[PDB]
């Protein structure tokens, strides 16, 4: 599992979310930043470590404008996911 | 030293906290999210390997309610903390 | 190359953007969160190079401290690349 976390521009939320939804990637989570001041958008998701590749190049085409200030796209280490509502605890390791 | 975040459903709050205290942690960051939507509350908290699945466990307790949408809590590497007051940094291999 | 996130008083700001700033550090993005009771700070997140990350977390404590209990933390984690979305390079740093 990696954590994804994208900084985009406010606009893009949705053309991401699009390529989210269609990519198989069920869920995320959006919050405002100001990127250094720039209004931005901070999306995170954490997915296994085969759709990686996938997910940031569907990030990055549906993010992308072109111009100065399209942000960046982090890409960290996540040990496990635990669904709160179940209790299940998701551990991938190499 | 791991990372732990949760996403949870703001009017755990309160519990989260409560049963973070009585679990020893002291000291967490809030943060308001929006899980795709709902409106969510990031909580970051770091604790040794030996505390993970304890504090994960009382994390679970305290923040479902059963239904969907109850959230998740990703479990992340850390390398160090700095406790800015006193300018000490504490380290440990990942 | 590593994740550098520092929980600091909101009127920090400044004297840490000017603080990184003549560090060599370009771009950080900027949240509002609060430190538990509640007391408003603000998230600073930046990614450096391994090399640039003792120097970077000096500075960030010596802008940042008041010496008063509540002054914050920082966090340092392990990145594997960054994207830069215009483009589309994959930036990797290792040793
Ligand atoms: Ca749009
Ligand atoms: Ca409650």
Same mark, same amino acid.
């Given at each position: 599992?990696? @954590?994804? =976390?994208?900084?985009?521009?406010?606009?893009?939320? *949705?053309? !991401?979310?699009?390529?989210l939804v269609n990519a198989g990637i069920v869920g995320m989570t959006v919050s405002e930043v100001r990127g250094?001041?720039?209004?931005?958008? @901070?999306? =995170?998701?954490?997915?296994?470590?085969?759709?990686? *590749?996938? !997910?940031?190049?569907?990030?990055?085409?549906?993010?992308?404008?072109?111009?100065?200030?399209d942000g960046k796209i982090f890409i960290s280490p996540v040990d496990s996911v635990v669904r709160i509502r179940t209790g299940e605890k998701d551990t991938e390791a190499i």
């Amino acid at each position: 599992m990696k @954590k994804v =976390e994208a900084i985009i521009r406010p606009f893009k939320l *949705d053309e !991401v979310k699009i390529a989210l939804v269609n990519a198989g990637i069920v869920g995320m989570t959006v919050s405002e930043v100001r990127g250094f001041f720039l209004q931005k958008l @901070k999306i =995170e998701i954490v997915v296994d470590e085969g759709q990686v *590749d996938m !997910v940031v190049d569907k990030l990055v085409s549906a993010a992308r404008t072109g111009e100065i200030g399209d942000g960046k796209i982090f890409i960290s280490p996540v040990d496990s996911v635990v669904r709160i509502r179940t209790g299940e605890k998701d551990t991938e390791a190499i």
